[PDB]
Write a protein that binds this ligand. Structure first.
Ligand SMILES: Nc1cccc2[nH]cnc12
Ligand SMILES: [Cl-]
Ligand SMILES: [Cl-]
Ligand SMILES: [Zn+2]
Ligand SMILES: [Zn+2]
Length: 124
């Protein structure tokens, strides 16, 4: 395995950190590990990003910042404000994707209607 520090350093100093990690994953690289898994009942709302763990039976709940490429790389977030959607919150990851929470949050978008992940929880 490359190891978390080797992967995160490679992405952090890349001109495009998101593309560096996606290309690394596509190459067969081991996902970033040591995301902070939360103790929960799996009876929550199943919403994507929440003040407290909200995993349903089809999700795992994690500490938000631990699942954010930009937080883990200690680099600026790519928006005008440099605001992080995940920091200080809990993130629900479909169990089928929970081996790679950083890649999941990087690649996916929260539905502004139901507040669930588009293409997963979202039933709009
Ligand atoms: N997705 C899940 C549902 C119920 C229990 C579980 N323990 C770990 N993941 C779980
Ligand atoms: Cl580590
Ligand atoms: Cl979901
Ligand atoms: Zn972040
Ligand atoms: Zn929706």
């Amino acid at each position: 395995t490359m190891g978390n520090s080797t992967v995160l350093s490679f992405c952090a100093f890349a001109v495009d950190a998101a593309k560096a990690y996606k290309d690394y994953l596509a190459s067969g690289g081991q996902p970033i590990t040591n995301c902070v898994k939360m103790l929960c009942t799996h009876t929550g709302t199943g919403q994507a990003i929440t003040v407290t763990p909200e995993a349903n039976m089809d999700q795992e709940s994690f500490g938000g910042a631990s699942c954010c490429l930009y937080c883990r790389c200690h680099i600026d977030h790519p928006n005008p404000k440099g605001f992080c959607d995940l920091k200080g919150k809990y993130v629900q990851i479909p169990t089928t994707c929970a081996n790679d929470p950083v890649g999941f949050t990087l690649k996916n978008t929260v539905c502004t209607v139901c507040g669930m992940w588009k293409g997963y929880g979202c039933s709009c």
